[PDB]
From a paper:
In some invertebrates, including the earthworm [name], haemoglobins are large extracellular oligomers with D6 point-group symmetry comprised of 144 haem-containing subunits. Giant haemoglobins are arranged as 12 protomers (1/12th units) assembled around a central scaffold of 36 linker chains. Each protomer contains 12 haem groups and possesses a local threefold symmetry axis which relates three abcd tetramers to each other. The abcd tetramers themselves have a quasi-C2 symmetry axis, whereby the ad and bc dimers each share a further local dyad axis that is not perpendicular to the quasi-C2 axis of the tetramer.
We demonstrate our approach using the giant haemoglobin from [name] as a test sample. This molecule, also known as [name], has been a favourite test sample in electron microscopy because of its large size (3.6 MDa) and its ease of specimen preparation. Our [name] haemoglobin reconstruction (global FSC resolution of ∼3.8 Å) is comparable in resolution to X-ray crystallography maps. In the best parts of our map the resolution is sufficient to distinguish between large side chains. Some acidic residues have apparently lost side-chain density, which is likely to be a consequence of radiation damage. The most stable part of the map is the linker-chain core of the complex; the haem-containing globins on the outer periphery have a lower resolution owing to flexibility/movement. In our sample many more ‘top views’ than ‘side views’ were present, generating better statistics in the preferred orientation. We conclude that our cryo-EM resolution is in line with the size-related resolutions achieved in X-ray crystallography, and is also primarily limited by the size and flexibilities of the complex. The quasi-atomic environment of a haem group has been elucidated by single-particle cryo-EM for the first time.
Author numbering:
A (entry chain O): 62 to 222
B (entry chain K), C (entry chain G): 3 to 151
D (entry chain H), E (entry chain D): 8 to 147
F (entry chain F): 1 to 145
G (entry chain N): 65 to 229
H (entry chain M): 64 to 225
I (entry chain E), J (entry chain A), K (entry chain I): 5 to 151
The structure:
Amino acid sequence: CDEHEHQCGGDDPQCISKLFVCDGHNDCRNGEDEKDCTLPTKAGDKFIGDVCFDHCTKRRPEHMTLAFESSSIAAFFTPIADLHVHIEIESETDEDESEVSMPADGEYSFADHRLTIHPPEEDGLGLVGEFDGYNFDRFVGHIVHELSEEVCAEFIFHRKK
Amino acid sequence: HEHCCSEEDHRIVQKQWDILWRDTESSKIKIGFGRLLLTKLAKDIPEVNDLFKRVDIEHAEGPKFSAHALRILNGLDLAINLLDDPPALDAALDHLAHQHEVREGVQKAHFKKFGEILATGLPQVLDDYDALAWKSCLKGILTKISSRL
Amino acid sequence: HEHCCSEEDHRIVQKQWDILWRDTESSKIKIGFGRLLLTKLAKDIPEVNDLFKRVDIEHAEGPKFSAHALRILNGLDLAINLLDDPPALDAALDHLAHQHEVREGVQKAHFKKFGEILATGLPQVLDDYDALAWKSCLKGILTKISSRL
Amino acid sequence: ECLVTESLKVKLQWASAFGHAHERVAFGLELWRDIIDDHPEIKAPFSRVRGDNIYSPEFGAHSQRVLSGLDITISMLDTPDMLAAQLAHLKVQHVERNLKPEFFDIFLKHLLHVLGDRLGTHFDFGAWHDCVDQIIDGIK
Amino acid sequence: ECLVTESLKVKLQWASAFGHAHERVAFGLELWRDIIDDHPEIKAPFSRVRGDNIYSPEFGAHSQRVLSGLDITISMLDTPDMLAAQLAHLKVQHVERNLKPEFFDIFLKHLLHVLGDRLGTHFDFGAWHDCVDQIIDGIK
Amino acid sequence: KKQCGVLEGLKVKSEWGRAYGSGHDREAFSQAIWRATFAQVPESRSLFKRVHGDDTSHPAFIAHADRVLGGLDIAISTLDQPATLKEELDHLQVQHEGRKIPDNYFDAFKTAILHVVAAQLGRCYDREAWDACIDHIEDGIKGHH
Amino acid sequence: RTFQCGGNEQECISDLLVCDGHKDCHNAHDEDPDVCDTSVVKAGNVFSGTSTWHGCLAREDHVTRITITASKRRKFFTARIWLRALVESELERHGENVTSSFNAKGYYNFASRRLILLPTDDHDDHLAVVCSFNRGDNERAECHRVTEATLHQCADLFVTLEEHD
Amino acid sequence: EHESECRGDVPECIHDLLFCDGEKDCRDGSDEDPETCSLNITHVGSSYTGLATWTSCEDLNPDHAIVTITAAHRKSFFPNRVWLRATLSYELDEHDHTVSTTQLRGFYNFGKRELLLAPLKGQSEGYGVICDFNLGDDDHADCKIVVPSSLFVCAHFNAQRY
Amino acid sequence: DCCSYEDRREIRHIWDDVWSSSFTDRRVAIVRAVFDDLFKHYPTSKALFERVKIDEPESGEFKSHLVRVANGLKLLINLLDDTLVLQSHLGHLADQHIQRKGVTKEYFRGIGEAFARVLPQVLSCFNVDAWNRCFHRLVARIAKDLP
Amino acid sequence: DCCSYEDRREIRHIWDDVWSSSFTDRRVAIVRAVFDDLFKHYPTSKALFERVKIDEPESGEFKSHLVRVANGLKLLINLLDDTLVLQSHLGHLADQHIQRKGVTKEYFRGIGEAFARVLPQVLSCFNVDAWNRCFHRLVARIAKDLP
Amino acid sequence: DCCSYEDRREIRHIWDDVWSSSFTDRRVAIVRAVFDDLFKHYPTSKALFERVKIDEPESGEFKSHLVRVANGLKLLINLLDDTLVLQSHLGHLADQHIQRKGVTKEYFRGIGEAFARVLPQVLSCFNVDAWNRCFHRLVARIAKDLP
Ligand code: HEM
Ligand code: HEM
Ligand code: HEM
Ligand code: HEM
Ligand code: HEM
Ligand code: HEM
Ligand code: HEM
Ligand code: HEM
């Protein structure tokens, strides 16, 4: 595809702009952009990642947790469906058995399957989820300095069952 | 027909034409760059000076006229960024011609100059460009305007 | 397991040797570049001058001799481009020796000069090259020719 | 001492370093910019081509017509007979203008300069320097 | 003012910019080409090495023997005792030829020039310029 | 007149350069021609008993084929000078003259080169242009035209 | 543009020996059915599919369909398949549905598995088509229409094998 | 370089001397599992093959080449590496079918999964071989004969096992 | 009619096939056949070019004419990727043709065909439509006033 | 016998292991052991090199000899990727050895062994065959015109 | 407290959003609002800057003040990837503030907040913690030798 465009083609590539996936009506002449409007992440769903490598050091945790307060859909225009998420981190050191759970609010985009978390603290660390698109039990999402767009630390999340 | 203003050319145009607006806060650019194009027209054909009375052309830096200078370049801009997907552009320009139609005292020979100003005016304000390309596209915009006159 | 003229060298040769023929219409190149190699031979050993009577060497620019100059470089060329896959090359050169055999009055010591001309002649006509490499390969071509004399 | 083998090499190296297209103009303008920094008076005769500012167009046009000439010269440099003919016609163009015979001898010094950086250590100076003389003398 | 530390730095930077192999010859010939464009008379003494045309071989050979010398010098520049020994033997080679004492002082000016482009803004001029003097004076 | 057409003479001169290449593909480009020829005329192998022409992949034969192209390269190289061609070409006459070559065979070896060139070459060439030029060379070696 | 064997062992072989009826690779991967597979262009097959246009001849996105007409294989030089075909354009310009057509010759490699069609005797533009069957399967194919000289791309189109019988 | 990612769900990057050690140095302890310690590849007598192309030396034209493992030892106190000996053999093409036979020694590294060998000493035509088993199974490879000094790539052969 | 863009890349390759060499053997023989094809349809023009000894087909001079025509013609092409340097060099090349007698505005439009009848025999792949369209806008501008 | 090519790359690595430093501590100790191994088999040569105060094994001078031998020897190697500049610098280095007395053609063929004798003990991976082949064609071109 | 490193890359992007233009319309309006926010909390300082005709908010002069503050401030930032050139240019910029009267050590620690209270309203993504940390070590090195 080209830049902000999205590739719908199953067997006969058709290149369409990003703003028309789950638009509400047929744009891709296949008809393959409307099949996907079911949202995958339901309230109460709880993801737990393990660290891959970490240079953005607040508490440099062993592994951190992520939960969904509530998903919500703006009725009229729904490529994007906003979220409330806790982020729990249970640390340990010399001294203290500190805790944390900062609330934030992201949005999941049916377009490129990414979810975002807007910085929970003022430190300006966005968490950029990315699914593969066919799985939804795990994502390779990793943290980013919201200003600079630089990969700092990765985690591999899993759904719990 | 079918040949003039080929696909590959306007890709060059849009790229070069976009080098100006890479800067932010470009309101002042195209006010100024627009303010010159109308005055420099009046000093060739003096007749047209009468036409701009409603916008008060007598004040060059005047606010009431300045806001008109934006609307001409901005109206030209959407034309260039819409060059691809032709069937829309025809409708886009058709609505400009009709907009110049109800206005009286607009003579077809004026644009012929306005092209020659701009065709030799442009090469001062850009880094690089292929004159042959711009020549093709601006014949497209201008000639189709005035088709109602 | 024999050492002289190792694989990696002739790859260098073929690359450098090919820089000449990158140009098209190279008939005139190797006519001229061939015309010099035979004359410059006669002014060292005068004896050999008699051998070329059949081709009329007396005319340098003469057509009848020019067509002979091609055949020598062209015959040398196929030798170089065939350096890889050795067992063919042996048969290739073997057929040249026998071609020089039936001709009478060709003395083995001649080639020893013809190498020294070419070994010091070549460095003028190329951009870059490793003299050590060429030295190895041309000992291969020349020494194997004349093995019938 | 030139015209044979030692001439042939100048052709091959003329092909490479001279480049092509937008790379050609950039070559020419990089030449003159050498000599005008060295010998400031040389820009007097160019008032016809607006040699006030070399980077301006219309001189860009000129300097390419220049190099194009060397092509005609160097290209036919093998066949001696037809060589003089172009050299004959060429001088005629330079008769009607104010020159010094020393500017020519200066030119070849700064031309073989610029080819240095692109060819580094690889070429025969002897081949060029002497065989550009056979071009330059025909202009006197 | 040349000392244990401010000398040490010259060694490390000599390693990098000096390069290796085909890159070394290209370095040397890029040096002399600087000074001969600046001071045209300097090519008088080189008639032995055919310094008519520097790009020709056999001068290429020479200029590398030159730089190789600085290696011997700069390499031993830590141990003061053995330093003078090479400086002693070196001057002997330059006694029998026509020189001016000003060409030396010129040399170090144009050598530290060329290292500029390859090292950009990173090095101690003070370290070089003073510590090349300790090499140059031993030749007088 | 659909003859060597001195302009068209240099047409093939250019194309040939692009087909007959550098590197070891040339040795492969040779194999094609012969493997093609023998399949048209099974009994033509008898003429090569001296060169080990029984099997075509044997090293002694590979050498033989390069000289053939090598020789033919000289021909197509110079169609500019009508003098030197007739000189160089005339040499080939006395090469073949000492044995019996029917005019049927090197009509087929003509057909062979065409197909192989087309494949080897970049999708574009004019047959009727090639058809003339190599046929001029064929009239050459045959000795009478 | 040389044929790559693959398997236990691999190495180059020049494109002109690929399917010649002679062993050329050591393990014979080149004379096999799965690579030779004489007919992916047997006459009567029809291919279809749409084409975007990002190059010259700028117009709306529409449907095309190439159909193979002819086929030939000279049993002396067996290495390529010379063939004819017909190219169809169902574009709607305006005021009707107007259908362009032309005839095209060209050939089809076994080495590279890609056919190439040039228009014949056509004074009119008609830009040439080039395919490739890189899928390893014989239904689908990637094509793009190209100018005959420079060979730079234009109009990337995909095609499918229309159903036989 | 100089490290090897782990085998499991979550990729970490751990230094090469810590595999098959007898101490877990990962997150999950991938280093203890028989999906890694399995010796199936260097059991004595195994042999790899596949015809080689020569680029750098000998220019022999593609002909078969095998590697074989004559004897393997694993020292009880330093289980990180499997020391072993081999014999490379490849077909010179003269007239009759003939083969020159180098003789080798080297180690097998569980990290890289790549055994690497070297010529012994006073052996004609001293070559060495580098086999990477980075494909899925313990069979097939992408080897290369190299000159022992530079690790410059003499001859590249993609080898299987019978 | 609109040189466009793609047509220029079409040219740049076409011209690279005919021009490729450091020798002049080929570049001569091609351009000589252009005029040799021209004079057959306008024998009146042959009365001009007397200054160059036209009467001798093979002269030691006449070549030195056609050679400068090529190197001038080739000089045009290598500017098409960079315009605005064309006009300047175009206007110049125009004025060198008004300083003499006998320029038929009619003859320029003639040689436009002359290539179109003598190109397709040197090359193989060739675009008649392209070469013919972008060539007029060259010639139509070197015959701007008259002659 | 044919320096070839691959042998030269073989050298350029071997030589890079011994020569790697900006200090002279290592380059000295290696080359000194070359001659120290030489004189053991040709004590007659030791009668030469009296100019440099040979009799002192650790002199403030003698080092300043061996150091220039290395930097001269290392100067050879760094030319092998570029020939034709070797011959010139080879012929030069030859003539500097004919201007004195007591340099026998027999001595060079001796030191050829001297490296092979004890140069390995410094390195680990080493090719005797390579270093021995390309070294003669250096030395057998020094003793050509010398007795 | 330790400018560190990543904080500097954090700055270099933040500063690139505010400074991006060749026009001065934006760079002015931002920095003017800094002092306009400063004077609200320290009206005493406004008694200084009388030399520049402070009393006119839109003077033909006053802009020519703030403009040099920016280009001076921007001059600092573009050195952060290269230190040791900072100190020199830091010490210089310090001394230009001691040659006058009415510059209190208390004023600098004030404007440190002035950006923080009103620097973001211009940007969107912004790191308060970073910009606040690396800015003191700039300013706390200006007020060292000053009362
Ligand atoms: C070349 C591209 C041009 C464009 C895109 C353009 C566009 C416009 C538009 C859109 C308006 C109407 C504004 C509105 O609807 O509120 C306008 C007004 C006008 N234009 Fe143009 N224009 C162009 C060139 C010219 C030229 C060459 C002339 C005269 C020689 C001209 C004379 C006028 C006049 C007299 C008005 C009257 C506006 C008023 O009184 O408020 N325009 N133009
Ligand atoms: C170095 C590579 C050489 C090659 C590849 C070569 C090749 C050839 C070939 C193939 C021919 C026969 C032409 C034919 O049958 O059509 C020929 C002819 C001849 N060669 Fe050479 N040659 C070489 C060197 C020499 C040298 C060094 C001499 C003499 C000093 C020599 C003397 C001759 C002579 C006298 C003929 C006679 C041709 C005639 O009578 O028409 N060649 N050469
Ligand atoms: C070295 C070989 C030289 C060649 C081949 C050469 C060739 C030419 C050519 C072809 C022209 C233009 C003719 C035309 O436009 O029709 C010309 C013009 C000119 N040349 Fe040269 N030139 C050379 C050297 C020089 C030098 C060293 C100078 C020094 C200043 C010079 C100064 C000029 C000037 C001023 C013109 C412009 C004439 C005018 O505007 O009327 N040329 N030259
Ligand atoms: C800057 C440090 C310098 C060093 C280390 C140096 C070193 C040397 C060396 C080693 C030789 C050759 C000895 C031999 O081949 O046996 C030599 C020769 C020479 N040096 Fe220098 N030199 C230096 C500066 C200069 C300068 C500035 C000049 C200025 C022209 C100069 C002119 C020459 C000449 C002409 C020769 C040639 C002797 C001959 O060929 O007979 N040198 N130098
Ligand atoms: C364009 C067509 C041909 C050309 C240019 C050509 C050229 C040549 C050349 C250059 C040789 C080299 C002789 C030598 O090196 O001593 C040769 C040998 C030979 N040619 Fe051809 N040839 C052609 C067609 C044919 C055909 C069609 C045949 C047979 C069907 C043939 C049979 C032979 C034979 C048998 C020899 C070798 C004679 C021997 O070994 O004693 N040629 N040819
Ligand atoms: C089609 C493209 C053409 C180009 C680019 C071209 C260009 C040139 C150039 C550069 C010269 C040399 C001028 C000089 O040395 O200053 C020349 C000479 C000449 N051209 Fe052309 N030419 C073209 C076509 C024609 C045609 C069609 C005619 C006549 C029918 C013509 C008549 C001449 C004449 C007579 C001269 C000789 C000038 C003299 O007598 O001194 N040219 N041309
Ligand atoms: C094997 C490689 C050798 C090389 C590359 C070499 C090179 C050199 C060089 C560059 C010098 C200094 C010349 C100068 O300062 O102008 C030198 C000095 C000398 N070399 Fe060698 N050399 C070698 C072997 C030998 C051998 C084997 C001998 C004797 C058996 C020898 C005897 C000498 C002597 C006596 C000097 C001192 C010259 C003087 O008294 O000033 N060299 N050598
Ligand atoms: C926070 C960073 C600041 C920087 C980087 C800075 C830098 C500068 C610079 C470069 C000048 C112009 C000096 C010249 O032209 O040579 C200037 C002028 C001035 N600055 Fe600042 N300044 C800062 C803050 C302040 C503050 C907080 C005050 C007072 C509260 C102050 C008071 C002045 C005054 C009075 C002048 C005018 C000098 C004159 O009277 O001519 N500055 N500043």
